[PDB]
Design a protein around this ligand. Structure first.
Ligand SMILES: *[C@@H]1O[C@H](CO)[C@@H](O[C@@H]2O[C@H](CO)[C@@H](O)[C@H](O)[C@H]2NC(C)=O)[C@H](O)[C@H]1NC(C)=O
Ligand SMILES: *[C@@H]1O[C@H](CO)[C@@H](O[C@@H]2O[C@H](CO)[C@@H](O)[C@H](O)[C@H]2NC(C)=O)[C@H](O)[C@H]1NC(C)=O
Ligand SMILES: *[C@@H]1O[C@H](CO)[C@@H](O[C@@H]2O[C@H](CO)[C@@H](O)[C@H](O)[C@H]2NC(C)=O)[C@H](O)[C@H]1NC(C)=O
Ligand SMILES: *[C@@H]1O[C@H](CO)[C@@H](O[C@@H]2O[C@H](CO)[C@@H](O)[C@H](O)[C@H]2NC(C)=O)[C@H](O)[C@H]1NC(C)=O
Ligand SMILES: *[C@@H]1O[C@H](CO)[C@@H](O[C@@H]2O[C@H](CO)[C@@H](O)[C@H](O)[C@H]2NC(C)=O)[C@H](O)[C@H]1NC(C)=O
Ligand SMILES: *[C@@H]1O[C@H](CO)[C@@H](O[C@@H]2O[C@H](CO)[C@@H](O)[C@H](O)[C@H]2NC(C)=O)[C@H](O)[C@H]1NC(C)=O
Ligand SMILES: *[C@@H]1O[C@H](CO)[C@@H](O)[C@H](O)[C@H]1NC(C)=O
Ligand SMILES: *[C@@H]1O[C@H](CO)[C@@H](O)[C@H](O)[C@H]1NC(C)=O
Ligand SMILES: *[C@@H]1O[C@H](CO)[C@@H](O)[C@H](O)[C@H]1NC(C)=O
Ligand SMILES: *[C@@H]1O[C@H](CO)[C@@H](O)[C@H](O)[C@H]1NC(C)=O
Lengths: 212, 168, 116, 49
C-alpha cells in the first residue's frame, strides 16, 4: 500500500533516456539553418542568386557541414545504444534470478534477505518490486563455542548456544527461539581441553529418563 | 572550452566559428556528462554503508591480527599500512581539471567503516542492523558455508590464525 | 591569466530567488558579504557553517551547499550516522522480530527507433 | 556487495579456492580487494563405495 502512495504522489532514469533522445533529435534539425560559411542556409537562395559555376562552391560548403552533423548524430546514438543494451541485459538477468527464483547474492534483489520479486511494465523499461525479510528488535546474550559434558565437547547442529544470564539454550541464528540442549540438537567431537571458550553445562539425554 | 581552444583570444575567429551552429554546445554537454558519471561511480562503489562503524579499543579477535589494514591514528589522512603503500606506487588553452566530490580522506573513512562492520558483525550489517558476534564464531559460521564442519575450525584455531597472519 | 567556469547554485525558483556563485579554481581575490575559498574555487553568496549535514547540492572536494529553512550555505558533507557495535569476546545479538519490506527498482530496456 | 558484505558461492568471483571473506582497501582512482580463501592440501587416496 505504500508503493502506491509514494508513486501516486521517481522515474528519473526512464525520463532521462527520453530527454536525451529528444535533445539530440532537436539539435539535428536546428543544424539545417546554419551557413557553415556560405551566403545562406537555403538551396533555393543559392540557386537563385548565383550561376551554376558559383553555386557549386556554395553548395559544397553546406553539404560538408550537414554530413558532419548527421554523422555526429549517428556516432552518439551508437554510444547511447551500447549503454541501453547493458541495462536491458541486467534487467533480463534480474527477471531470471529474482522473479523466477530466490537469489542468495547479497543486494542483487533488494536490501535484506530476498524472499520474492514481482515485475511491472513501464514506458520503456521495467520496475521490479522486491520483497525481502529484515530482522528487527535484537537482544544481547552471552555465547560459547561448545559445551563440555562428561569430558566431551558438544557443538550445535544448526544453531548457537546462548545464555539468558543463568541458563543455556540453543537458538537458530536469525530468530530467537530457545531450546533445551539435548543430544538431538548437538554433536560430539573430542575432549573439552582444546577448544578455547568451552563452558560447563549439562547435555540432556532423552532416552535415559524416559526408558527408566 | 571549445571556443577558447579553437579561436583563442582572437575576435576574427569567434564570428567565423559562430557560423557552425551548436557544435561546441554538444561537446561541452558530452564532457560534462562524463564528469558527472565519475562521481556516481565512486558513490556506488564506496558509499555502501549506513553508519560509520568503529572497531573497539581492544583487539581480541581470536588470535587474528588486522593491524596492517586498520586505519593508522598517527596520520592526517588516517590511512592504513596497505593503503599508504598503494598511494606511493601510482593551466592551458581552455583545459581544466575539476576535483572529485569526495576527498580520498572520505574514501578511506568509508573503507575503514566497511572493515569494522565485517570484523565485528560478519554479514549482518549488510542486510539490516549490525549484530555483534565473536570473530572465532563468525569464522566457524563461514567454515560451514564452504562445507567444512565447524569443529575443524575450533580445534585448529591457532594454526588457522597463524596462516592468515603470514599470508597478510 | 586566470580563467574558469562560472556556476550558479539555486535552491529552485519555487523556493526562493536567491543565488550563490562559484568561480571555478579561481583565487577568490581576483574575482571582480560572504566570500569563501574552496578547493573547488571561490564561492560568493553562501555562508560557511561548522555543522555537517547530508549532502544536498554538491560543490566539490567534500563541500556541499543547502538552503535550510534562511540563506544558502557551505560545509563538508556527511558520510553518515555513527553506529557503535558493542563487540566483545563472548557477546552476541539475536533478533526477536522481523519486518517485511518491499522496494522498487527501475530499469530502461529500450529507446526509440529512428530512421533518417 | 557480494564478497565483502557476504559470502559467495560463485566460483572464482572472489579469488581461487572456497571464498571465506574479503577486505577492501582504497587505491588512487580504484579499489583493492584482499580475498581470503580456503585451499585443500595433502590428500590421500582411499577405496570407496
Ligand atoms: C548490548 O550490550 C551493550 C553493552 O552495554 C549495549 O551497548 C552499550 O549501550 C549503552 C546504552 O545504550 C551505551 O552507553 C554504551 O556505549 C554501549 N556500549 C558499550 C557499553 O560498550 C547495547 O545497548 C546492548 N544491545 C542491546 C540490543 O540491548
Ligand atoms: C532464564 O530462563 C529461564 C527459563 O527456563 C528462567 O528460569 C525459569 O523461570 C520461570 C519464571 O521465572 C520459573 O517458573 C522457573 O522455575 C525457572 N526455572 C526453570 C528451570 O524453568 C530464568 O529465570 C531466566 N533467567 C533470567 C535472568 O531471565
Ligand atoms: C568444568 O568441569 C570440570 C570437571 O567437572 C572442572 O575440572 C575440575 O576443576 C577443578 C578446579 O580447577 C579441579 O580441582 C579438578 O581436578 C578438575 N577436574 C577435572 C576432571 O579436570 C573444570 O574446572 C570446570 N571448569 C570451570 C571453569 O569451572
Ligand atoms: C600484528 O602484526 C604486526 C606485524 O605486521 C605486529 O607488529 C610487529 O611486531 C613485531 C614483533 O611481534 C615487531 O618486531 C615489529 O616492529 C612490529 N611492527 C610494527 C609495530 O609496525 C603486531 O604486534 C601484531 N599485533 C599483535 C597484537 O600482536
Ligand atoms: C513484532 O512486531 C510487530 C510490529 O511489526 C508487533 O505487532 C504490533 O504490535 C503493536 C502493539 O501490540 C500493535 O499496535 C501493532 O498493530 C502490531 N503490528 C501489526 C502489523 O500487527 C509484534 O507485537 C511484535 N512481536 C513481538 C514478540 O515483539
Ligand atoms: C594415489 O594413487 C595413485 C595411483 O593409483 C597415484 O598416482 C601414481 O602416482 C605416481 C607418483 O606420482 C605415478 O608415478 C604413477 O604413474 C601414478 N599411477 C598411475 C596409474 O598413473 C597418486 O599419486 C596417489 N595419490 C596420493 C595422494 O596418494
Ligand atoms: C576473553 O577475554 C577475557 C578478558 O576480559 C579473558 O579473561 C578470557 O580468557 C577471554 N576468553 C576467550 C574465550 O577469549
Ligand atoms: C512547487 O510549487 C507548488 C505550488 O506553488 C508547491 O505545491 C510545491 O511544494 C513546490 N515545490 C517545492 C519543492 O517547493
Ligand atoms: C590567493 O592569493 C593570495 C595572495 O598571494 C594567497 O595568500 C592565497 O593563498 C591564494 N589562494 C590560495 C587558495 O592559495
Ligand atoms: C568553527 O570551529 C573552529 C574550531 O577550530 C573555529 O575556529 C571557527 O571559528 C568556527 N567557525 C564558526 C563560523 O564559528
Amino acid at each position: 500500500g505504500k508503493i502506491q502512495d509514494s508513486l501516486s504522489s521517481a522515474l528519473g532514469k526512464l525520463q532521462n533516456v527520453v530527454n536525451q533522445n529528444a535533445q539530440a533529435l532537436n539539435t539535428l534539425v536546428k543544424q539545417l539553418s546554419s551557413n557553415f560559411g556560405a551566403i545562406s542556409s537555403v538551396l533555393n537562395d543559392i540557386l537563385s542568386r548565383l550561376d551554376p559555376p558559383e553555386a557549386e562552391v556554395q553548395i559544397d560548403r553546406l553539404i560538408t557541414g550537414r554530413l558532419q552533423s548527421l554523422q555526429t548524430y549517428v556516432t552518439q546514438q551508437l554510444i547511447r545504444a551500447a549503454e541501453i543494451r547493458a541495462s536491458a541485459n541486467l534487467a533480463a538477468t534480474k527477471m531470471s534470478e529474482c522473479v523466477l527464483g530466490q537469489s542468495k547474492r547479497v543486494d542483487f534483489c533488494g536490501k535484506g534477505y530476498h524472499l520474492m520479486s514481482f515485475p511491472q511494465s513501464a514506458p520503456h523499461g521495467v520496475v521490479f518490486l522486491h520483497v525481502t525479510y529484515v530482522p528487527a528488535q535484537e537482544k544481547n546474550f552471552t555465547t560459547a563455542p561448545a559445551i563440555c559434558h562428561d569430558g566431551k565437547a558438544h557443538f550445535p547442529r544448526e544453531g548457537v548456544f546462548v545464555s539468558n544470564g543463568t541458563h543455556w539454550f540453543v537458538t537458530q541464528r536469525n530468530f530467537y527461539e530457545p531450546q533445551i540442549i539435548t543430544t538431538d540438537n548437538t554433536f560430539v567431537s573430542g575432549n573439552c581441553d582444546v577448544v578455547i571458550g568451552i563452558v560447563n553445562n549439562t547435555v540432556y539425554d532423552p532416552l535415559q529418563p524416559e526408558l527408566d | 572550452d571549445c571556443t577558447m581552444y579553437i579561436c583563442g583570444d582572437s575576435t576574427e575567429c569567434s564570428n567565423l566559428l559562430l557560423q557552425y551552429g551548436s557544435f561546441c554546445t554538444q561537446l561541452n554537454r558530452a564532457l560534462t556528462g562524463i564528469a558527472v558519471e565519475q562521481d556516481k561511480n565512486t558513490q556506488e562503489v564506496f558509499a555502501q554503508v549506513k553508519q560509520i562503524y568503529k572497531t573497539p579499543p581492544i583487539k581480541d579477535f581470536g588470535g587474528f591480527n588486522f593491524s596492517q589494514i586498520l586505519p593508522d591514528p598517527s596520520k592526517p589522512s588516517k590511512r592504513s599500512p596497505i593503503e599508504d603503500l598503494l598511494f606511493n606506487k601510482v593551466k592551458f588553452n581552455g583545459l581544466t581539471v575539476l576535483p572529485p566530490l569526495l576527498t580520498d580522506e572520505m574514501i578511506a573513512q568509508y573503507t575503514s567503516a566497511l572493515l569494522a562492520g565485517t570484523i565485528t558483525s560478519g554479514w549482518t550489517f549488510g542486510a539490516g542492523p549490525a549484530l555483534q558476534i565473536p570473530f572465532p564464531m563468525q569464522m566457524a559460521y563461514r567454515f560451514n558455508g564452504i562445507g567444512v564442519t565447524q569443529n575443524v575450525l575450533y580445534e585448529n584455531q591457532k594454526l588457522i590464525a597463524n596462516q592468515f597472519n603470514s599470508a597478510i | 591569466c586566470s580563467f574558469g567556469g562560472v556556476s550558479v547554485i539555486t535552491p529552485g525558483t519555487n523556493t526562493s530567488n536567491q543565488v550563490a556563485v562559484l568561480y571555478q579554481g579561481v583565487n577568490c581575490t581576483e574575482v571582480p558579504s560572504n566570500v569563501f575559498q574552496t578547493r573547488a574555487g571561490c564561492l560568493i553568496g553562501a555562508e560557511h557553517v561548522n555543522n555537517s549535514y547530508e549532502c544536498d547540492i554538491p560543490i566539490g572536494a567534500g563541500i556541499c551547499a543547502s538552503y535550510q529553512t534562511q540563506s544558502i550555505i557551505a560545509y563538508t558533507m556527511s558520510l553518515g550516522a555513527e553506529n557503535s557495535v558493542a563487540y566483545s569476546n563472548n557477546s552476541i545479538a539475536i533478533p526477536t522480530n522481523f519486518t517485511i519490506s518491499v522496494t522498487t527498482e527501475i530499469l530502461p530496456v529500450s529507446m526509440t527507433k529512428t530512421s533518417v
